[PDB]
Design a protein around this ligand. Structure first.
Ligand code: HEM
Length: 154
């Protein structure tokens, strides 16, 4: 697929607001994912044991990981579709080391869109959400094709 420049703009405009607080957004998103789809917490051997949301809010590890997840996503979105080189190492460790099915990437995409919608309603109207969804679908489709080359497709 291919986003228009206008769609990239809407995506990079709401992302410039996320970047004013990357650790807080990272926490919100991962907690939104784990509440919604608790099976995904099992993949994180680091803090599979956190039982409640208050425990999650207080885990410094969970917050570091969130910052690492968002910072890498943001670097991919800034490429505007030209992301081949940033995807490779990423598709390799998620497919061979962590074994993250494509479906979990769909779950975290839904968590990102939920948080942006709550935190940034003025910059995240319908067109901006549609553009973000497009940018994340593009990201999943390219990562899925890379999984397949790497022998995982999952
Ligand atoms: C927006 C999508 C995602 C991005 C850009 C992302 C990126 C990253 C990055 C950059 C790291 C650190 C280096 C590496 O291990 O590759 C990481 C580690 C990790 N990611 Fe992903 N990730 C994404 C989705 C997920 C999801 C959905 C899961 C699980 C349901 C997941 C599971 C993990 C795990 C288990 C680690 C290890 C964390 C730690 O213990 O160090 N990731 N991810």
């Amino acid at each position: 697929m291919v986003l228009s420049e206008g769609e990239w703009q809407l995506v990079l405009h709401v992302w410039a607001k996320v970047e004013a607080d990357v650790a807080g957004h990272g926490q919100d998103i991962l907690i939104r994912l784990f509440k919604s789809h608790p099976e995904t917490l099992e993949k994180f051997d680091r803090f599979k044991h956190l039982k409640t949301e208050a425990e999650m809010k207080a885990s410094e590890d969970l917050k570091k990981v969130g910052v690492t997840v968002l910072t890498a996503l943001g670097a991919i979105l800034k490429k505007k579709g030209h992301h081949e080189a940033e995807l490779k190492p990423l598709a390799q460790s998620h497919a061979t080391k962590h074994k993250i099915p494509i479906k979990y990437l769909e779950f975290i995409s839904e968590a990102i869109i939920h948080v942006l919608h709550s935190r940034h309603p003025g910059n995240f109207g319908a067109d901006a959400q549609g553009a973000m969804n497009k940018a994340l679908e593009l990201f999943r489709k390219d990562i899925a094709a890379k999984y397949k080359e790497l022998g995982y497709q999952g």
